[PDB]
Amino acid sequence: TLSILVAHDLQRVIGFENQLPWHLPNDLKHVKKLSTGHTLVMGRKTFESIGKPLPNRRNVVLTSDTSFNVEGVDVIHSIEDIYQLPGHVFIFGGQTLFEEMIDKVDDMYITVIEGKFRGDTFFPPYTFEDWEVASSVEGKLDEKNTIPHTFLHLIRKKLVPR
């Protein structure tokens, strides 16, 4: 199974200056719950933003740099290598990988950040015409988690004749 895992705002912003535009602990918890025990594929810039591999899961980084080697990170040099990875693979970011993979994935785990942030990187446009909402769950707000957010699990719709 190949899935997208992403948080994007009302305008599909996902990043600003190589960081998340928002501070939202609940969403990183969401990420931890979904991806622990599985595989993350991410582009080089996303990896450098985080700075180190996320524990208790396989970290795969896509880059054209053959000098790339990081302790605890598997490196690939092409999209095609993604399909050789076993188990549940989450496309983790950033904009470039999402653009490259959105027409290829089975489903998407999207956190809609219900706000408008300054961004310089975006998730590609998509329509609920093409994606079934398997689930939609409002995130709970508190003192530390003040931005409204909704967890979507979207599954690609089958094209059929009507």
Ligand X SMILES: NC(=O)c1ccc[n+]([C@@H]2O[C@H](COP(=O)([O-])OP(=O)(O)OC[C@H]3O[C@@H](n4cnc5c(N)ncnc54)[C@H](OP(=O)(O)O)[C@@H]3O)[C@@H](O)[C@H]2O)c1
Ligand Y SMILES: COc1cc2c(cc1OC)[C@H](C1CC1)N(C(=O)/C=C/c1cc(Cc3cnc(N)nc3N)cc(OC)c1OC)N=C2
Distances (CA, A) of 8 to 63, 93, 110, 131, 161: 23, 11, 7, 16, 32
Binding mask 45-74 for ligand Y (x = CB under 6 A): -x--xx-x-xx-------------------
Distances (CA, A) of 13 to 7, 72, 89, 101, 127: 8, 29, 23, 17, 16
Structure token digits, residue 44: 């080089």
* Cβ count within 10 A of residue 26: 17
Q: Which phi-psi region, left, alpha or beta, contains residue 17 (left: φ > 0; alpha: ψ -120 to 50)? A: left
Question: How many angstroms separate the CA atoms of 138 and 136, rounded?
Answer: 7
Q: Which stretch binds ligand X (CB under 6 A): 18-26, 52-60, 126-134, 144-152?
A: 18-26
Nearer to ligand Y by C-beta: 28 or 70? 28
CB of 86 to ligand Y, least distance (A): 20
- Find which of ligand Y, ligand X, none residue 32 binds, CB within 5 to 8 Å per kind: ligand Y
By the rule CB under 6 A, 79 interacts with ligand X: yes
Assign 19 to helix, strand or coil: strand
Residues lying near ligand Y in the complex (CB under 6 A) are found at 5-7, 19-20, 27-28, 30-32, 46, 49-50, 52, 54-55, 92-93, 111
Residues lying near ligand X in the complex (CB under 6 A) are found at 6-7, 14-15, 18-20, 42-46, 49, 62-65, 77-79, 92-97, 100, 121
Q: Binding site residues, as ranges?
A: 5-7, 14-19, 27, 43-46, 49, 57, 62-65, 92-97, 100, 121
